[PDB]
Amino acid sequence: KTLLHKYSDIPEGTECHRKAYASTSIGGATGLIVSAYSIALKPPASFLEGVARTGRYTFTSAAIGAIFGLTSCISAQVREKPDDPLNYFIGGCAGGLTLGARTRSYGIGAAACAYMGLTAALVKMGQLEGWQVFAEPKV
Amino acid sequence: LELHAPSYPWSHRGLLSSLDHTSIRRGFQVYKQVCSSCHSMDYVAYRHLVGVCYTEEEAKALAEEVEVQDGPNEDGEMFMRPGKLSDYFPKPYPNPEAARAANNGALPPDLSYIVRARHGGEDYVFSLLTGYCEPPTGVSLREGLYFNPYFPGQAIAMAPPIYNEVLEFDDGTPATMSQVAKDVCTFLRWASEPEHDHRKRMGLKMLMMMGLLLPLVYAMKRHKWSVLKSRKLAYRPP
Amino acid sequence: EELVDPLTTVREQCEQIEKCIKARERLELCDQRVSSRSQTEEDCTEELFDFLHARDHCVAHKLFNSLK
Amino acid sequence: GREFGHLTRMRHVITYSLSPFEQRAFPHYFTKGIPNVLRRTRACILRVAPPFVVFYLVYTWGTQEFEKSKRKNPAAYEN
Amino acid sequence: MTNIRKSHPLMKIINNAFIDLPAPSNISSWWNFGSLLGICLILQILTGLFLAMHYTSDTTTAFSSVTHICRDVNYGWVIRYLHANGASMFFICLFIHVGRGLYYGSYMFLETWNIGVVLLFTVMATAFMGYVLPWGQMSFWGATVITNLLSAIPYIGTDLVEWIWGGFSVDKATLTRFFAFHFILPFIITALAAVHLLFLHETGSNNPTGISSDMDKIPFHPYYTIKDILGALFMMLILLILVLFSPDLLGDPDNYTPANPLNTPPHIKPEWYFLFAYAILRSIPNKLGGVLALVASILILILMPMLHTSKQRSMMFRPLSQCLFWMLVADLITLTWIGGQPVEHPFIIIGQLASILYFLIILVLMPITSIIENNLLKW
Amino acid sequence: IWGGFSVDKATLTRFFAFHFILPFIITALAAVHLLFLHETGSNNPTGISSDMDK
Amino acid sequence: MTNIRKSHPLMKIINNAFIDLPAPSNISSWWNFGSLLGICLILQILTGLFLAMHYTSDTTTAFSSVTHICRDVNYGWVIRYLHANGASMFFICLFIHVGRGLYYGSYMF
Amino acid sequence: AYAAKNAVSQFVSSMSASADVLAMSKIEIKLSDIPEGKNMAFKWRGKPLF
Amino acid sequence: LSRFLGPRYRELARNWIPTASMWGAVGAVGLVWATDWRLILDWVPYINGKF
Amino acid sequence: APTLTARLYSLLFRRTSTFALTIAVGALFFERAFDQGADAIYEHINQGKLWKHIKHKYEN
Amino acid sequence: SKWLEGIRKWYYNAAGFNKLGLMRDDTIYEDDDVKEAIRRLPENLYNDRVFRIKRALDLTMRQQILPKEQWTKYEEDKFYLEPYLKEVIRERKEREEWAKK
Amino acid sequence: SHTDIRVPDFSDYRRAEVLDSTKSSKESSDARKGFSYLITATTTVGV
């Protein structure tokens, strides 16, 4: 949760380098978890193969996070509109393009751009409007 | 700490825009009736305003208004002459030290190149003229110094030089402080860059000529290089 | 009459703007702080700089339209 | 010294050329040109861009830090 | 009979140089900057000759002379601003050509490269002397700052600086000497450029691939003459954009105030082409160390051929060296930006690190990376 | 050439500039001169070819 | 190996021009004037460049600037009169040179 | 060698400070024309003298 | 430097050191003579008369 | 049927003397035409500002 | 070995001499040793090198790359010049050693 | 030998007038040369 607090604490549209670093850390953590699950469920033939798979997944996730944070913060700075979800959408589409590049497929890139950008815009909207993915029971 | 001047939408900001010579004429009125007393324009002469904002007859009449010292006569003594279009704008003070003495130890800068000299150009002058304000809390001004936020240091020897109805324009335009500052800034821009409109015209002509020539010269280069570009090389060993 | 300069009207309009209003409030707070202290060396020049930056940025867009 | 006749020895290389007047100066200039430009940019960008991105980050950080340095510090006047 | 072009002596030289010169067919548009540099030199010479017909080197009349050229000489502003911005175009092309030689291994042409280094130094001297001529506040104070650096030289710095000044401080003598030197030096530059072309023609011209192109040599006349004319037209487009739309974009406004030796300008910064050396100089705290570092920045180019360790001449086929080269370019841009900026907390550390990085990239990182690439290729 | 109605400041400045530049053009024309002479050698006081005695 | 004077391009040009140029053995002192003309050109250029360091071309300051060169400048009078009389030496050598060309039929080149 | 030394020295000295500058080397400042509490700046040796 | 590290080159250096030292002295005297370096020239007896 | 460009080639472009005649006459007429057109363009862009536009109000 | 081979293959593909049809030795800087090695090459190899270099230069002239099917593979790249260059460098080293003493 | 290689097709690069292989090129030579030299003449006039 400390990484999420790190990403949130940096003001939007400011300290773009720190925001990119936080996004990269989050992407790396997610990639590490995915790599652990992949190694367990689908066993790697060798320790070197497991390390290669972990590195590939982690680098892809970290690149996605870094591109998302860098592009979103830079767009927020240049447009100068901090709370606009379009910045998050641009960052998400850039992340999807990065995923397509890492997977060396155009179709993956385009589908990821659309879906990931929309999800990031929705996340920004949830920040602005106070949407709760997990709601404390209040009845 | 300094306050950068806002970028006002001057008419001449356009890439191919020209100074409004009506504003230049009113700015010359403003200079000759307000600024000339302290500031000077050594590098501008009445002849320079003969096809810009005043006619030749008007320019000569303006020159004849101001007396000018003339080369010594047969007796060997200098004398005062009515003034001629060749003569440059009269200098307000005989020497810089006298100007400093008149203005509390500060030398009123020459306004011939002021717009180019100062960062911000006409925007800086406009803001400084219209930017006088009461000294901020915690800031104490020395005797003879007026707080102007835009001026570096925020302390200026010049007193608020433009006020409503400082002068009456010949055109009849209302003599508001903003209008006077705008006209004077336009005139100063003309002074610093008397070739502004001609530069713009030459720029338009050069842009069109380049738009014509570059595609044609590129076409010539392509015509010559097509032989190499389409070349097909085949290695046929024995 | 008094030939109300368009600068007065435009700066009054700009003062009725969120950035100008908040800058003015900060300026007022620093004014109270500096006035209270007997021998403080602080000044309100920076807060005035913020307020005037916002106000005159608005005035840049508005003023010249009036001046003909 | 360096003249066309004796520059180098080459054998069995046949070259076919066409007259400039028989061929179009701009063949498929956009249909083929834009994809090739995109390919070259794709190849170059990864190597070229990152350093200028680093420069942009450094420039923004330096400008913001200088602006902050000029700004007043409330603690100095607390007493 | 014989063709006059191939048999007449002057026509023989001209033909060998620019009509029948065997030129690589794959030279890119980065091979158009040098001819653009020669065009810039010729344009500077002509515009300056026309300017000097109206310029007086006395301190009383220099600034008034420049104002006379701008406001009273017919089309004088065109000539003056053409000269001012042509100097900037000159240095832009100079830097681009240095970069092209670095990237494509053209420094392996040792004689041409060293003559080019000499030419770069001469052109920088010419530009610095020219800036003093208008005699604005920037000219006077920048000359004072730069010339005073020579005092750091031990046991002869003061005497040398006074000899250059012509006196105790920058004054009428310095202005007249600088006008004379500014006039003479460009022709020396032309002769050095002739030697440069002679040495280049001895070895031919390197192609982007870095491989010998004797097989694919094409005549220069029906191909590179028109390519260079097109490049010159593009450069003229840019220069005229500067001259006719932003005549003062690349110049400090303070030089439009007459020089006052008793009051310094708020910011004393050199011309943009000199700003990286200025940043390097300010980086080193000691004055003599700063002067030596500023000298080494340009003189490091002399060591470039020795530092080469790649089995491949060009960087086209070496990616990591490409990454390092673009890091170097970004570092040079950063040094220019820092040199422009005031000396303060954020900028000082950036400038020091940037200078360290410039020297590190040139001397250490690049050769070790080339060795690593050689190992990776199994060479 | 005068730069005006008569000889004056413009003429003097022009002449200083031209006077400065021309000697260098002379220094280049001299090199062309020597190239042309080297093509044909140097004549002798006799005026008879001296390839035998060089 | 090779001789650097022959092999090197600039050294080759200098060698062919001045060092090992085939020269007639009988060319008399009248032939010396051309090199004297080159020496005069070099001396004039140097002296005029050192004069130009102290010469202002404004009509107000030109005569006073030459007087400054003569009086105040250190050894300035030597330079100024070297330039003045070097012009005369240059023209004397030019006339003798053209006379040699006319008398010995050098115009056939 | 003697002749060349003399000529080169002559030119180099010609580039050196002239008689007028050396005459301006030393400056006389008239005190009692500067009021108490005032700093008078004079150009001596081409640089501000306080 | 790899090529010029051998017994012959060390012998070659010894042969040319006397010539290099003599030329260095020629440069030292020429510099002092041309610059009239009073520091060095004061020691020399007859030239000392200059100052 | 010869095209317009073929007629141009045969009449003028083929022999370089006629080519240069075309070039020079076109240069004269193009100087006139382009100067007129671009001056009109700039005057329209700045109509009412240029002194020429406003000279009448103050002359006579 | 496999890890080193993978990184070497990555460098091979990252460098573009394969894209232009060139082999690694085609891209070597022509120093004097390399010039002698080329002079010693058998005629077939010399002609193949000349044509490959010419084709690469033509492709670079038009800023084009060879079709991906025709790219030189890392496995099939043959170091033709390396033995001749090694022999030349050995001869030069022997001569230098003799010169040393 | 020399009879086993035919000049590669240039049809994609060829101009429209000379695309057909059953039509004399002399018919269109004037038009093509005129177009190229018209480009040249216009460039010269602008210069």
Ligand code: HEC
């Ligand atoms: C004396 C009665 C004045 C007249 C009338 C005007 N100005 Fe002035 N000005 C005056 C002084 C004594 C000073 C020096 C203040 C200082 O410390 O700088 C000035 C200064 C200016 C400046 C500042 C330029 C600079 O140094 O950066 C400007 C731009 C200026 N003055 C303009 C100006 C205009 C537009 C005036 C009338 C239209 C005008 N001045 C009148 C004294 C006097």
Ligand code: HEM
């Ligand atoms: C007035 C300044 C200069 C002029 C007029 C000039 C001119 C030229 C010209 C016309 C060429 C041939 C055209 C070309 O290769 O593009 C050339 C080549 C070259 N120049 Fe310069 N140059 C200048 C400065 C420099 C500098 C500062 C450097 C290096 C620091 C340099 C290094 C080179 C090199 C290495 C080449 C060979 C390029 C190659 O072989 O591909 N030159 N120069």
Ligand code: HEM
């Ligand atoms: C590569 C060659 C040259 C370069 C790079 C160069 C550079 C410059 C620069 C940057 C300026 C300052 C312009 C300004 O401040 O507005 C200048 C001024 C000047 N130079 Fe040069 N110059 C060159 C050659 C010449 C030559 C050949 C002459 C004369 C023959 C000359 C004479 C002048 C003059 C008279 C000025 C004053 C212009 C002014 O004050 O605006 N220069 N030069």
Ligand code: HEM
């Ligand atoms: C600055 C101007 C000139 C210079 C530097 C110069 C230099 C030279 C030199 C060095 C030579 C070699 C032969 C010798 O030394 O006598 C020469 C030869 C010659 N020059 Fe020039 N000269 C100049 C002017 C002229 C003029 C004005 C003429 C005729 C109007 C001329 C015509 C000749 C001829 C005919 C020769 C052939 C000499 C022979 O037969 O050996 N030169 N010049």
Ligand code: HEM
């Ligand atoms: C190359 C052949 C040259 C000739 C034949 C020549 C001739 C002359 C002559 C006759 C004078 C007037 C003498 C007098 O003071 O009464 C003069 C003055 C002058 N020349 Fe030279 N000159 C030459 C080269 C140069 C060059 C290359 C320069 C470069 C700066 C130069 C700079 C000057 C100056 C500044 C003056 C005026 C200073 C003075 O009056 O003493 N000259 N020249």
